[PDB]
Coordinates of C-alpha atoms (C1' of nucleotides) and ligand atoms in Angstrom, one line a residue:
Chain A
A297 CA 204.1 106.2 44.4
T298 CA 203.2 105.8 40.7
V299 CA 199.6 104.7 40.3
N300 CA 200.6 102.1 37.7
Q301 CA 203.2 100.7 40.2
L302 CA 200.5 100.8 42.9
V303 CA 198.0 99.0 40.6
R304 CA 200.6 96.2 40.1
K305 CA 201.0 95.8 43.9
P306 CA 198.1 97.2 45.9
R307 CA 198.5 98.6 49.4
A308 CA 198.9 95.8 52.0
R309 CA 196.9 96.3 55.2
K310 CA 199.3 95.5 57.9
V311 CA 198.0 93.3 60.8
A312 CA 198.6 94.8 64.2
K313 CA 200.0 92.2 66.7
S314 CA 198.5 92.0 70.2
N315 CA 200.5 92.8 73.3
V316 CA 198.9 89.8 75.0
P317 CA 199.2 86.9 72.5
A318 CA 198.7 84.2 75.2
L319 CA 195.1 85.6 75.9
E320 CA 194.2 84.9 72.2
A321 CA 191.9 88.0 72.2
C322 CA 190.1 86.9 75.4
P323 CA 189.7 89.2 78.4
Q324 CA 190.7 86.7 81.1
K325 CA 192.0 83.2 81.2
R326 CA 192.2 80.7 84.1
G327 CA 195.5 78.9 84.9
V328 CA 197.5 76.9 87.4
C329 CA 200.4 78.6 89.2
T330 CA 203.5 76.5 88.2
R331 CA 206.0 78.5 90.2
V332 CA 206.0 81.2 92.9
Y333 CA 209.1 83.2 93.2
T334 CA 210.5 86.8 93.3
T335 CA 212.3 88.9 90.7
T336 CA 214.0 92.3 90.4
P337 CA 212.8 95.3 88.6
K338 CA 214.5 97.1 85.7
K339 CA 217.2 99.8 85.8
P340 CA 215.8 103.1 87.2
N341 CA 214.0 101.2 90.0
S342 CA 214.9 98.8 92.8
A343 CA 212.6 96.5 94.8
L344 CA 211.7 92.8 95.2
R345 CA 208.8 92.5 92.8
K346 CA 206.4 89.5 93.4
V347 CA 205.7 87.5 90.3
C348 CA 204.3 84.0 89.6
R349 CA 204.8 81.5 86.8
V350 CA 201.4 80.1 85.6
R351 CA 200.3 77.4 83.2
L352 CA 197.1 78.3 81.3
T353 CA 194.3 76.1 80.1
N354 CA 195.4 76.5 76.4
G355 CA 199.0 75.2 77.2
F356 CA 200.7 78.6 77.1
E357 CA 203.3 79.1 79.8
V358 CA 203.7 82.7 81.0
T359 CA 204.7 84.7 84.1
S360 CA 202.1 87.0 85.7
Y361 CA 202.4 89.8 88.2
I362 CA 200.7 90.1 91.6
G363 CA 199.6 93.7 92.1
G364 CA 198.4 93.3 95.7
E365 CA 200.2 93.5 99.1
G366 CA 200.7 90.0 100.4
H367 CA 199.4 86.8 98.8
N368 CA 198.5 83.3 99.9
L369 CA 199.7 81.8 96.6
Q370 CA 201.7 78.6 96.2
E371 CA 202.0 75.5 94.0
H372 CA 199.0 74.4 92.1
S373 CA 197.0 77.6 92.9
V374 CA 194.3 78.3 90.4
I375 CA 194.1 82.1 89.6
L376 CA 192.5 84.3 87.0
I377 CA 194.8 86.5 85.0
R378 CA 194.1 89.6 82.8
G379 CA 196.0 91.7 80.4
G380 CA 198.4 94.5 81.3
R381 CA 202.2 94.5 81.2
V382 CA 204.6 95.6 83.8
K383 CA 206.7 98.5 82.6
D384 CA 209.8 97.5 84.6
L385 CA 209.6 93.7 84.3
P386 CA 210.5 92.5 80.8
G387 CA 208.5 89.5 79.8
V388 CA 205.6 90.1 82.2
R389 CA 202.5 91.0 80.3
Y390 CA 199.7 89.9 82.6
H391 CA 198.3 90.7 86.1
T392 CA 196.7 88.3 88.6
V393 CA 193.1 89.3 89.4
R394 CA 193.0 89.7 93.2
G395 CA 189.9 88.4 94.8
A396 CA 189.0 85.8 92.2
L397 CA 189.0 82.0 92.3
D398 CA 191.8 80.9 94.8
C399 CA 193.3 84.4 94.9
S400 CA 192.2 86.2 98.0
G401 CA 191.5 89.9 98.1
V402 CA 194.0 92.5 99.3
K403 CA 193.9 93.0 103.0
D404 CA 193.1 96.6 104.2
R405 CA 192.2 97.9 100.8
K406 CA 190.2 101.0 101.1
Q407 CA 190.7 102.9 97.8
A408 CA 190.3 101.3 94.3
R409 CA 188.8 98.3 96.1
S410 CA 187.1 97.0 93.0
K411 CA 190.5 96.6 91.4
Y412 CA 191.6 94.1 94.1
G413 CA 188.5 92.0 94.7
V414 CA 187.9 93.2 98.3
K415 CA 184.4 93.3 99.7
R416 CA 183.1 96.6 101.0
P417 CA 184.2 97.1 104.7
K418 CA 181.2 97.2 107.1
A419 CA 180.5 100.6 108.5
Chain B
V27 CA 156.4 136.6 109.1
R28 CA 157.8 137.8 105.8
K29 CA 160.3 137.0 103.0
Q30 CA 163.8 138.0 102.2
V31 CA 165.4 139.2 99.0
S32 CA 168.5 141.0 97.7
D33 CA 169.4 143.0 94.5
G34 CA 167.2 145.9 95.3
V35 CA 166.8 149.4 94.0
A36 CA 166.6 152.7 95.8
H37 CA 164.2 155.5 94.6
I38 CA 165.2 159.0 95.6
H39 CA 162.5 161.7 95.4
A40 CA 164.6 164.9 95.9
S41 CA 161.9 167.5 96.2
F42 CA 162.6 171.1 97.0
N43 CA 160.9 170.7 100.4
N44 CA 161.5 167.0 101.4
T45 CA 163.5 163.9 100.5
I46 CA 161.8 160.5 100.1
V47 CA 164.0 157.5 100.4
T48 CA 162.4 154.2 99.4
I49 CA 164.2 150.8 99.1
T50 CA 162.4 148.3 96.8
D51 CA 163.1 145.2 94.8
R52 CA 163.6 145.0 91.0
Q53 CA 159.9 144.5 90.5
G54 CA 158.7 147.6 92.4
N55 CA 157.6 145.9 95.6
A56 CA 158.5 148.2 98.5
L57 CA 160.6 146.9 101.3
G58 CA 161.1 150.0 103.5
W59 CA 161.1 153.7 103.4
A60 CA 162.1 156.7 105.6
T61 CA 161.6 160.5 105.2
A62 CA 163.3 163.6 106.5
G63 CA 159.9 164.7 107.9
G64 CA 159.6 161.5 109.8
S65 CA 163.2 161.8 111.2
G66 CA 162.4 164.6 113.6
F67 CA 163.0 167.5 111.1
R68 CA 160.3 170.0 110.2
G69 CA 160.3 173.3 108.3
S70 CA 163.6 174.3 106.9
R71 CA 165.3 171.3 108.6
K72 CA 163.1 169.0 106.5
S73 CA 165.0 169.9 103.3
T74 CA 168.6 170.4 104.3
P75 CA 171.0 167.8 102.7
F76 CA 172.1 166.7 106.1
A77 CA 168.6 165.6 107.3
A78 CA 168.3 163.7 104.1
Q79 CA 171.3 161.7 105.0
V80 CA 169.8 161.0 108.4
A81 CA 166.7 159.7 106.7
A82 CA 168.9 157.1 105.0
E83 CA 170.2 156.0 108.4
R84 CA 166.6 155.0 109.2
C85 CA 166.2 153.1 105.9
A86 CA 169.2 151.1 107.1
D87 CA 166.6 148.8 108.6
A88 CA 165.2 145.7 106.8
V89 CA 168.8 144.3 106.9
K90 CA 167.7 141.0 108.5
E91 CA 164.3 141.3 106.7
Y92 CA 166.1 141.7 103.3
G93 CA 169.8 141.2 102.7
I94 CA 169.8 143.7 99.8
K95 CA 173.6 144.3 100.0
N96 CA 173.9 145.4 96.3
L97 CA 171.2 147.9 95.2
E98 CA 170.4 150.2 92.4
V99 CA 169.9 153.9 92.8
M100 CA 167.1 155.9 91.1
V101 CA 167.2 159.7 91.6
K102 CA 164.4 162.1 90.6
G103 CA 163.7 165.7 91.6
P104 CA 165.9 168.8 91.6
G105 CA 165.6 169.5 95.3
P106 CA 168.6 169.4 97.7
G107 CA 169.6 165.9 98.7
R108 CA 170.8 164.5 95.4
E109 CA 174.3 164.0 96.9
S110 CA 174.0 163.6 100.7
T111 CA 171.7 160.5 100.8
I112 CA 173.9 158.7 98.3
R113 CA 176.9 158.9 100.7
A114 CA 174.8 157.6 103.6
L115 CA 174.0 154.5 101.6
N116 CA 177.7 153.7 101.1
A117 CA 178.5 154.3 104.8
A118 CA 175.6 152.0 105.8
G119 CA 177.3 149.0 104.1
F120 CA 175.6 148.8 100.7
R121 CA 176.9 148.1 97.2
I122 CA 175.8 150.9 94.9
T123 CA 176.0 149.4 91.4
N124 CA 174.5 152.0 89.1
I125 CA 173.4 155.6 89.7
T126 CA 171.0 157.2 87.2
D127 CA 168.7 160.2 87.2
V128 CA 165.0 159.5 86.6
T129 CA 163.8 163.1 87.0
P130 CA 160.6 163.5 85.0
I131 CA 161.4 166.0 82.2
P132 CA 158.4 166.7 80.0
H133 CA 158.9 167.6 76.3
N134 CA 156.6 170.6 76.5
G135 CA 153.8 168.7 78.2
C136 CA 151.4 170.2 80.8
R137 CA 151.4 173.9 81.6
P138 CA 153.4 174.6 84.8
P139 CA 152.0 176.7 87.7
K140 CA 152.4 180.5 87.4
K141 CA 155.4 182.3 88.9
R142 CA 155.5 183.3 92.5
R143 CA 155.5 187.1 92.3
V144 CA 156.2 186.9 96.1
Chain C
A43 CA 169.7 108.7 89.0
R44 CA 169.4 111.8 91.2
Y45 CA 171.9 113.8 93.1
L46 CA 171.2 113.5 96.9
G47 CA 174.2 115.2 98.5
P48 CA 174.4 118.8 99.7
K49 CA 173.4 121.4 97.2
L50 CA 175.2 124.6 98.2
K51 CA 178.5 122.7 97.7
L52 CA 177.8 122.3 94.0
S53 CA 176.3 125.8 93.9
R54 CA 179.5 127.5 95.2
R55 CA 181.4 125.0 92.9
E56 CA 181.1 125.9 89.2
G57 CA 180.6 129.4 90.6
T58 CA 177.8 131.6 89.4
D59 CA 174.7 130.7 91.3
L60 CA 172.3 129.3 88.7
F61 CA 168.7 128.5 89.7
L62 CA 169.1 126.4 92.8
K63 CA 167.4 126.2 96.2
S64 CA 164.0 127.7 97.1
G65 CA 165.1 131.2 96.1
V66 CA 163.8 133.1 99.1
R67 CA 166.5 133.2 101.8
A68 CA 169.5 135.1 100.5
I69 CA 171.9 132.6 98.8
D70 CA 175.0 134.3 100.3
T71 CA 173.8 133.8 103.9
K72 CA 173.3 130.1 103.5
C73 CA 176.9 129.5 102.5
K74 CA 180.1 131.3 101.4
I75 CA 180.0 132.4 97.8
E76 CA 183.3 133.1 95.8
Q77 CA 185.0 130.1 97.5
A78 CA 185.1 126.6 96.1
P79 CA 184.5 123.9 98.7
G80 CA 187.2 121.8 100.3
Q81 CA 190.0 122.6 102.8
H82 CA 192.1 124.0 100.0
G83 CA 189.2 125.8 98.3
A84 CA 190.5 129.2 99.5
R85 CA 193.0 129.7 96.7
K86 CA 193.1 130.8 93.1
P87 CA 193.0 127.6 90.8
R88 CA 194.6 128.4 87.5
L89 CA 192.0 126.6 85.3
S90 CA 193.1 125.0 82.0
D91 CA 191.4 124.5 78.6
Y92 CA 189.7 121.2 79.3
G93 CA 188.8 122.7 82.7
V94 CA 186.7 125.5 81.2
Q95 CA 184.8 123.2 78.8
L96 CA 184.2 120.7 81.6
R97 CA 182.8 123.4 84.1
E98 CA 180.4 124.7 81.5
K99 CA 179.0 121.3 80.7
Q100 CA 178.8 120.4 84.4
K101 CA 177.0 123.7 85.1
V102 CA 174.4 123.2 82.4
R103 CA 173.6 119.7 83.5
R104 CA 173.1 120.6 87.2
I105 CA 170.7 123.5 86.3
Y106 CA 168.5 120.8 84.8
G107 CA 169.7 117.8 86.8
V108 CA 170.6 115.8 83.6
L109 CA 173.0 113.0 83.9
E110 CA 175.8 112.5 81.4
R111 CA 174.1 109.5 79.7
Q112 CA 170.9 111.4 79.4
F113 CA 172.6 114.7 78.4
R114 CA 174.6 112.9 75.6
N115 CA 171.3 111.6 74.1
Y116 CA 170.1 115.2 74.0
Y117 CA 173.3 116.2 72.2
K118 CA 172.8 113.5 69.6
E119 CA 169.2 114.5 69.0
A120 CA 170.3 118.2 68.9
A121 CA 172.9 117.5 66.3
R122 CA 170.4 115.4 64.3
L123 CA 167.8 118.2 64.3
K124 CA 168.1 121.0 61.8
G125 CA 169.3 124.4 63.0
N126 CA 172.0 125.4 65.4
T127 CA 172.6 122.5 67.8
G128 CA 173.4 124.5 71.0
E129 CA 170.1 126.4 71.1
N130 CA 168.3 123.2 70.1
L131 CA 169.9 121.4 73.0
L132 CA 168.9 124.2 75.3
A133 CA 165.4 124.1 73.9
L134 CA 165.2 120.3 74.6
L135 CA 166.5 120.8 78.2
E136 CA 163.9 123.5 78.8
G137 CA 161.1 121.4 77.3
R138 CA 161.4 118.7 79.9
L139 CA 158.3 118.3 82.0
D140 CA 160.0 118.8 85.4
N141 CA 161.7 122.0 84.3
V142 CA 158.5 123.4 82.7
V143 CA 156.6 122.8 86.0
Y144 CA 159.2 124.7 87.9
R145 CA 159.0 127.7 85.5
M146 CA 155.2 127.4 85.5
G147 CA 155.4 128.1 89.2
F148 CA 154.1 124.9 90.8
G149 CA 157.4 124.1 92.4
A150 CA 159.7 126.1 94.7
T151 CA 162.7 124.3 93.2
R152 CA 163.4 122.3 90.1
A153 CA 163.9 119.3 92.3
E154 CA 160.7 119.8 94.1
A155 CA 158.7 120.5 90.9
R156 CA 160.4 117.4 89.5
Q157 CA 159.2 115.5 92.6
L158 CA 155.7 117.0 92.0
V159 CA 155.8 115.5 88.5
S160 CA 157.2 112.2 89.9
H161 CA 154.5 111.9 92.7
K162 CA 151.7 111.8 90.1
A163 CA 150.5 115.4 90.7
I164 CA 150.5 116.7 87.1
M165 CA 147.9 116.3 84.3
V166 CA 148.9 116.8 80.7
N167 CA 146.0 117.0 78.2
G168 CA 143.9 114.8 80.4
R169 CA 146.6 112.1 80.7
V170 CA 148.6 111.4 83.8
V171 CA 152.3 111.8 83.4
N172 CA 154.8 111.3 86.2
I173 CA 158.0 111.3 84.0
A174 CA 160.3 114.3 84.5
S175 CA 161.8 113.8 81.1
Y176 CA 158.5 114.2 79.2
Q177 CA 158.8 116.5 76.2
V178 CA 156.1 119.2 76.3
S179 CA 154.9 120.1 72.8
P180 CA 153.7 123.5 71.7
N181 CA 150.1 124.6 72.5
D182 CA 149.8 121.9 75.2
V183 CA 147.8 122.7 78.3
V184 CA 149.3 121.5 81.6
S185 CA 146.9 121.3 84.5
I186 CA 147.6 120.4 88.2
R187 CA 145.7 117.2 89.2
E188 CA 142.6 117.8 91.3
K189 CA 143.9 115.9 94.3
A190 CA 147.3 117.6 94.0
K191 CA 146.0 121.1 94.3
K192 CA 145.3 120.3 98.0
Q193 CA 149.0 120.3 98.5
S194 CA 150.0 123.5 100.3
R195 CA 153.6 123.3 99.0
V196 CA 152.3 123.9 95.4
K197 CA 150.3 126.9 96.6
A198 CA 153.3 128.5 98.2
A199 CA 155.4 127.9 95.1
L200 CA 152.9 129.8 93.0
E201 CA 153.3 132.8 95.3
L202 CA 157.1 132.8 94.8
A203 CA 156.7 132.4 91.0
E204 CA 155.9 136.1 90.8
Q205 CA 159.5 137.1 91.6
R206 CA 160.9 135.1 88.7
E207 CA 160.1 137.1 85.5
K208 CA 157.3 134.8 84.2
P209 CA 158.7 133.1 81.0
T210 CA 157.0 134.6 77.9
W211 CA 156.5 131.3 76.1
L212 CA 154.7 130.0 79.2
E213 CA 151.1 131.2 79.9
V214 CA 150.8 130.6 83.7
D215 CA 147.4 130.6 85.3
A216 CA 147.1 131.5 89.0
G217 CA 143.9 130.2 90.5
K218 CA 143.2 128.1 87.4
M219 CA 146.4 126.1 88.3
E220 CA 147.2 125.5 84.7
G221 CA 149.7 126.4 82.0
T222 CA 150.0 126.6 78.3
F223 CA 153.4 125.8 76.7
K224 CA 152.8 128.4 74.0
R225 CA 155.9 127.5 71.9
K226 CA 159.6 126.6 72.1
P227 CA 161.8 129.0 74.1
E228 CA 164.5 131.2 72.4
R229 CA 168.2 131.8 73.2
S230 CA 167.5 135.4 74.2
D231 CA 165.2 134.5 77.0
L232 CA 167.6 131.9 78.4
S233 CA 170.5 133.1 80.7
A234 CA 172.9 134.9 78.4
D235 CA 175.8 133.4 80.5
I236 CA 175.5 130.1 78.5
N237 CA 178.0 129.8 75.6
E238 CA 176.3 127.0 73.7
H239 CA 179.1 126.9 71.1
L240 CA 181.5 125.7 73.8
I241 CA 179.1 122.8 74.5
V242 CA 179.0 121.8 70.8
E243 CA 182.8 121.6 70.4
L244 CA 183.3 119.7 73.7
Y245 CA 181.0 116.8 72.7
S246 CA 182.2 116.9 69.0
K247 CA 185.9 116.2 70.1
Chain D
rU263 C1' 160.9 119.0 99.3
rA264 C1' 161.6 123.4 101.8
rU265 C1' 162.9 125.8 106.0
rG266 C1' 167.1 125.3 109.1
rA267 C1' 174.4 129.1 111.1
rA268 C1' 176.9 129.9 118.4
rG269 C1' 178.6 127.8 110.8
rA270 C1' 175.8 122.5 116.2
rA271 C1' 179.0 118.7 117.7
rG272 C1' 182.3 115.4 115.6
rG273 C1' 186.2 114.8 111.6
rC274 C1' 190.6 116.9 109.6
rC275 C1' 194.0 120.8 108.9
rU276 C1' 195.9 124.8 111.4
rU277 C1' 199.5 131.1 111.1
rC278 C1' 196.6 128.0 117.2
rG279 C1' 193.8 132.9 115.5
rG280 C1' 191.2 130.1 112.7
rG281 C1' 189.4 127.6 108.5
rU282 C1' 187.3 122.8 106.6
rU283 C1' 183.2 119.2 106.8
rG284 C1' 178.5 122.2 105.8
rU285 C1' 172.6 124.0 105.9
rA286 C1' 175.4 118.7 105.4
rA287 C1' 173.1 117.4 110.2
rA288 C1' 169.8 118.0 113.9
rG289 C1' 165.6 120.3 114.1
rU290 C1' 161.0 122.4 111.8
rA291 C1' 157.0 122.5 108.1
rC292 C1' 155.8 119.5 103.5
rU293 C1' 155.0 115.3 100.0
rU294 C1' 154.2 110.2 99.3
rU295 C1' 156.6 108.3 92.7
rC296 C1' 157.6 103.4 92.6
rA297 C1' 158.3 99.7 96.0
rG298 C1' 154.1 98.4 101.1
rC299 C1' 148.8 97.2 101.0
rG300 C1' 143.8 97.5 99.3
rG301 C1' 140.0 98.2 95.8
rG302 C1' 138.4 98.8 90.8
rG303 C1' 139.7 98.2 85.2
rA304 C1' 140.6 98.8 79.4
rG305 C1' 142.9 96.7 75.3
rG306 C1' 144.6 92.5 72.9
rA307 C1' 138.9 89.4 70.4
rA308 C1' 139.0 88.5 65.1
rG309 C1' 136.4 84.3 65.3
rG310 C1' 133.1 80.0 64.7
rG311 C1' 128.7 77.8 66.8
rA312 C1' 123.5 77.8 67.6
rG313 C1' 119.6 79.9 65.6
rU314 C1' 116.8 82.7 62.7
rA315 C1' 114.5 85.3 58.2
rA316 C1' 115.0 86.8 53.2
rA317 C1' 118.1 86.6 48.6
rG318 C1' 121.0 83.5 45.0
rU319 C1' 120.5 78.5 44.3
rU320 C1' 115.4 74.3 42.8
rA321 C1' 111.6 69.3 40.0
rA322 C1' 110.7 70.9 45.0
rU323 C1' 113.6 77.7 45.4
rA324 C1' 113.7 71.1 49.7
rC325 C1' 119.9 70.8 49.5
rC326 C1' 122.8 74.5 50.3
rU327 C1' 125.0 79.2 50.1
rU328 C1' 124.8 84.6 50.7
rU329 C1' 123.2 88.3 53.3
rG330 C1' 121.3 90.6 57.5
rC331 C1' 120.1 89.8 62.1
rU332 C1' 119.0 86.8 67.4
rC333 C1' 121.0 84.1 71.8
rA334 C1' 125.2 82.5 74.1
rU335 C1' 130.1 83.0 73.2
rU336 C1' 136.0 82.1 74.0
rG337 C1' 142.7 85.9 76.8
rA338 C1' 148.1 81.9 77.8
rC339 C1' 149.7 86.3 79.7
rG340 C1' 146.7 88.2 84.1
rU341 C1' 146.5 89.4 91.2
rU342 C1' 147.1 92.5 83.0
rA343 C1' 147.6 98.7 80.4
rC344 C1' 145.4 101.8 83.5
rC345 C1' 142.5 104.0 87.5
rC346 C1' 141.3 104.8 92.7
rG347 C1' 142.1 104.7 98.1
rC348 C1' 145.6 103.3 102.3
rA349 C1' 149.9 104.7 105.4
rG350 C1' 154.6 107.1 106.6
rA351 C1' 160.5 110.0 104.6
rA352 C1' 159.2 106.2 105.7
rG353 C1' 162.0 100.8 102.1
rA354 C1' 166.1 102.3 98.0
rA355 C1' 174.2 105.1 96.4
rG356 C1' 177.6 103.6 95.2
rC357 C1' 182.2 103.4 92.0
rA358 C1' 186.6 105.5 90.0
rC359 C1' 189.9 109.2 90.3
rC360 C1' 192.8 114.1 92.7
rG361 C1' 202.1 114.2 89.6
rG362 C1' 201.8 115.6 84.1
rC363 C1' 198.9 114.2 80.0
rU364 C1' 193.6 115.1 82.5
rA365 C1' 188.8 117.6 86.1
rA366 C1' 190.1 117.3 91.1
rC367 C1' 195.2 118.1 97.9
rU368 C1' 196.8 118.2 102.1
rC369 C1' 198.0 115.5 106.7
rC370 C1' 200.0 111.0 108.7
rG371 C1' 202.6 106.5 107.9
rU372 C1' 206.8 104.6 104.9
rG373 C1' 211.9 105.6 103.5
rC374 C1' 214.7 102.9 96.1
rC375 C1' 211.7 99.5 101.6
rA376 C1' 206.8 98.2 100.7
rG377 C1' 204.8 99.5 96.7
rC378 C1' 202.1 102.3 92.0
rA379 C1' 202.5 102.5 87.0
rG380 C1' 198.0 103.8 79.8
rC381 C1' 202.6 107.2 78.7
rC382 C1' 205.9 110.2 81.3
rG383 C1' 207.8 107.9 85.6
rC384 C1' 207.4 107.9 91.5
rG385 C1' 209.8 105.9 96.5
rG386 C1' 217.1 106.5 98.9
rU387 C1' 213.6 110.3 106.0
rA388 C1' 209.5 117.4 105.0
rA389 C1' 206.1 111.5 99.0
rU390 C1' 200.3 116.9 95.8
rA391 C1' 202.5 109.6 92.4
rC392 C1' 203.1 104.3 97.4
rG393 C1' 199.9 103.2 102.3
rG394 C1' 196.0 105.6 105.7
rA395 C1' 193.0 110.1 107.1
rG396 C1' 190.2 114.2 105.8
rG397 C1' 188.7 116.8 101.6
rG398 C1' 187.7 117.2 96.5
rU399 C1' 186.6 115.6 90.9
rG400 C1' 184.2 112.5 87.3
rC401 C1' 180.1 108.8 86.4
rA402 C1' 176.0 106.7 88.4
rA403 C1' 172.2 101.7 89.8
rG404 C1' 176.1 101.3 88.2
rC405 C1' 181.5 102.5 88.4
rG406 C1' 186.1 100.6 87.3
rU407 C1' 189.8 96.9 85.1
rU408 C1' 190.7 93.6 81.0
rA409 C1' 189.8 91.8 75.9
rA410 C1' 188.2 93.5 71.0
rU411 C1' 187.0 97.1 66.4
rC412 C1' 187.6 102.1 64.2
rG413 C1' 189.2 106.9 65.2
rG414 C1' 193.0 110.1 66.4
rA415 C1' 197.2 107.4 62.9
rA416 C1' 198.5 112.1 56.4
rU417 C1' 201.6 105.9 60.7
rU418 C1' 200.7 101.9 53.4
rA419 C1' 198.9 108.7 52.0
rC420 C1' 193.1 106.9 45.8
rU421 C1' 191.6 111.2 48.3
rG422 C1' 196.3 111.8 51.5
rG423 C1' 203.3 110.5 52.1
rG424 C1' 208.2 109.9 51.0
rC425 C1' 213.5 108.2 48.8
Ligands
MG544 MG1 170.4 104.6 83.4
MG545 MG1 153.2 101.5 93.9
MG546 MG1 194.3 119.0 87.1
MG547 MG1 191.9 99.0 74.0
MG548 MG1 195.3 106.3 57.1
MG549 MG1 207.3 111.0 56.0

RNA sequence: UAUGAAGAAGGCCUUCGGGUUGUAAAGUACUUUCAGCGGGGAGGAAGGGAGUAAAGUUAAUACCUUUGCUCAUUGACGUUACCCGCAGAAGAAGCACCGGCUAACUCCGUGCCAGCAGCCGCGGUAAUACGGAGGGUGCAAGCGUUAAUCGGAAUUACUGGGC
């Protein structure tokens, strides 16, 4: 409060921590799927959410979510992951980019197609 | 071959002997007209308020030629027909927006004709 | 870079008809005014606050076919320029070559007059300009290209120009097929239904 | 580009009467930007060289060097900037969103399933929130997602906070 006290100890600019530390301030990072399994959502919801454990190039080991219906993913699959946490899945902070590398596009996608790596359907 | 237009204006020449109904656009270009004399009425019949209404019925043409719909109303002249004609426009399916009198009233201008001693 | 869909849909949308289509055939006949498009259009939509601001901005843009990116650059210039920004922005939009040609009477529609500019049919001060976004400067003389005059569409557009109260700041020439952009336009001449202060706040958010 | 209304059909909804797509289309006039092709055509170009004649410069003004001039000059881009003719709408529109925030909605499918999800949260059999359809909103040769910086954040407050 007092200016003399503030002169003695100046204001300290707090550093804001990222929500995606494993990305190291990079938009996407490629990785290898260490494990494919299923997990359960939080409290107000009930489903069988599809998640994957993936080892990134920088050594970080994290679990990423699959936002598309159906996936041809298994051991040693190379996927591209982006930021974005799952509200109902604690510890899941990344999404698998559908339609990139060895991750196929979502079948029958017609709306928000660019968000799932699905080529435009022929007229 | 012609053009179409809306938002017209109707000029009403209510003379003591005849009634002149002319529908025109905002810029004074005439679209159609009808008169009591041209509606089968001569002599006294050419001035009665009724016949003036009938003249409007004729003016109900130009519909396809010009979808005026809403139109302005200009009224000049003290002759009978300052009321009748106006109704006929409503009953014809038109939107009367404003009604104003445009009767020429000189401020002691030209000398008028002498009185009819009869 | 240009809208290519149906036009009466937008016209009935936003609401008040504002300088679209040839302008001869009655606008009401071609469509159904006072009814937004869509299956659910026949209802009263309780507009919001964001809603009103958005509609006005969208309306203004369509009247002059200016895309957001383009329109935003006009707003930045208008704020930079001295004076009241909203009228300055309106002046800049009216000063575009394609709009000026439409008001000069060489095009039936702003889109067609814009196409006339685009199709290399307009001469400015002895120099060929086919850019719709060209800024006309005061005292300039705009003259239809010799070859262009042979287009009968231009001739018919002149005829219709009579109905639109000839803009004061534009000296139109009939047979001379020329025009003199006397000076910048003023708020009064422009449609009084535009609330420029709404535009200023919306982009200043 | 304009005209173009049995508001064509078809699509979807339907209070089964209709509406909606949408004057959108088709059709009918009209025009040919650029891209197609063809034919012209600046500017970047200043230069030095060769000569000349005079001047300064000399023992000789030889040597030069300064003028002026004279002839011939050089462009990588480059089939240039641009101009002119050719033909025919012909060759050129997607993307995201429509539960609130936040502009923009129903129908079908599904039934705490599958799923969405920036926040609030949806879905458990009449889902404006998922999936599909129509329709609509935003932006546009780009639209979205993600990452990052500031803002909003008076939320480290000196301006500009509190105990
Ligand atoms: Mg652009
Ligand atoms: Mg070309
Ligand atoms: Mg809304
Ligand atoms: Mg961010
Ligand atoms: Mg602060
Ligand atoms: Mg406090």
